[model samples]
Target: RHSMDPPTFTFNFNNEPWVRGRHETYLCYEVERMHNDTWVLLNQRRGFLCNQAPHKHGFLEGRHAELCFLDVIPFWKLDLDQDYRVTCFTSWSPCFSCAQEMAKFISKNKHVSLCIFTARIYDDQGRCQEGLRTLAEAGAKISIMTYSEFKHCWDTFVDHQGCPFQPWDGLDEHSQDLSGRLRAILQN
Candidate 1:
């Protein structure tokens, strides 16, 4: 495979702030399958995520990363008998439009379940929240990224050649706080 691999641009130490929601969003994903009551990572794909930039009109044209996941998923050749799980550690939660599409995808694909863990919430009081509710109805679990989750992403995705994951000062505190916020949004 290394004979002619696509030069994938991955996140590094500098991208830590972005993963913690500094500005633009970068969504990361991992797919796994249930084997005899245990979930194991799918060894097919290396990565499934992307970062976005504004279009020529200076508007945040969405859906690049989210849609990318949708576009490429069918290629994985998922098994009907084995339940598949997709986890997203998105820097920013899905927007309203993306949320709707995600729900539709899940509605159509019953064998796969999506679990979204967001670093930051987007438009929590508006259509975004509605979209989340829709997703939940479609069996998608929405939650905040806890400290352990963050470290897992760091170890698995980030270019940690420099050193192991170093947690930020408020990493644990903010994880709990954001989890609380997600709870509030879902309940009301």
Candidate 2:
């Protein structure tokens, strides 16, 4: 039995010693479905420290980190004998480039379905919605993860042991604000 821990928010924005270039970071959780209507935790990835400075070696994004890890998994190593529903939960929305790549992967894979849920929206001059729409056209269900969904993810995928999920004040309001922003982006 695979038990994955619930995603946690560090809320490190505008704080000292920020790991990534931005104060915001994300956690990526990949889950696979079994034949018995059960979900298995396939993998979990977190954004790491990036060298965001005057000198840069490569571009690093949390979505790309999950993709890189997924690409490296050998096909013959696991049991993929049946169709799988692959869902990825992230704290941050995928950028246009990453969204395109993920759509391509979903198009190529016949037996896999991809669903992406995020707590935030990434709007790049109205380009992010285009990417998301493209993904939707390619059979991906994208949604703004609500507080309820977050709690579900925590209960179903997170490994909190005996600790209960605690919701902070104004979380629902924040989710509503995020949902509104997502709607505005998609409406454009």
Candidate 3:
């Protein structure tokens, strides 16, 4: 019961047999950039069902998606010199391990910059704080999505017809809680 738009992709569990019986939740993401003053989709992928391969410890979607990207980079054959500004719009914030992986990915891929917009933090107690801190430290911008960012995802990725954007209340409350947790974790 959140105010954000539903995930754009609809995944069929049967299509992916490895995760068919896990009672897992799916995550979707879009990698986009500006081209000729218009946002161009470089990649879009979903179906990182929790408790699956590559991260069987219930790793978060961000890591799963990032791993998927790494696996397919050869297929995409992207130019490393294009100065890609990569914005990842995700349904949830990364867990600690995913954040670390993302940080390393960014560190190695110098031409790509990342900004993550998520609905909420995936705090595993204080375990995730350092990872998020590492991402921020490594120049990977992270934020909880505002209404404007949500609308941006809707317009940029969603394939809906004539449905106007709707915002949820207490976004500040959600953001504040995440910030407080992060700050407390970091201070210790």
Candidate 4:
């Protein structure tokens, strides 16, 4: 599994219900600046938003993706006078707890807006669904990754090892189904 990383990038974001059983979570994000409603891509990066990594000044330990971004934004020293847009093409949707933390982050950083496109619902029942609704209420746009979005992710996030991104079977169907599910979650 060294160079052959998870095609979970495709499998997770796949809209097919059968593929829901697969794993390998990744978040491919782009930070952008919005001026006159136009977007300027600032950075593009992707990784598994995990809790463990090497120790560097004890800073990177036990931090999720959001925590990492909050720290790095300031360090990057980008233009800070205007609001920003962040888009995350992820394998899994935010869990309930993660939704809360993300909501809190956006509340404080009112100038930052998040538009999350996930391949699957992590825990669609109970609190998981509620958390997404709550995050939506807080100004985050939660969505299921669709056909175009998936290709974009593959182009930007995947290092295909010389193989081009192949369109999997049922890609559109799965995405539409998941998209419908997301709408219901946001609706309720």
Among all candidates shown, the one with the greatest TM-score:
1
Q: Which tens-of-lDDT digit does each residue in 28-85 have in candidate 1?
A: 6778988889989975554646645666653366445667677777888888887989
List the candidates ranked by lDDT, beginning with the highest. 1, 4, 2, 3
- On lDDT, the stronger of 2 and 4 is 4
- Clashing residue pairs in candidate 2 (N, C-alpha, C atoms within 3 angstroms): 4-159, 5-158, 5-159, 6-158, 6-159
Judged by TM-score relative to the true structure, which candidate is superior, 2 or 3? 2
Model 4 scores a TM of: 0.78
How does each model score on TM-score? Answer: 0.80, 0.66, 0.63, 0.78
In model 4, the Cα lDDT at residue 117 comes to 86
Local accuracy of candidate 2 as per-residue lDDT tens digits, 43-103: 5422122112222444442334445535633342544566666666665666687678878
Q: lDDT (0-100) at residue 105 of candidate 4? A: 77
> Please, what is the whole-model Cα lDDT of each candidate in the order they appear?
0.69, 0.57, 0.54, 0.69
Who is ahead in lDDT, 1 or 2?
A: 1
Arranged by TM-score with the best first, the candidates are 1, 4, 2, 3
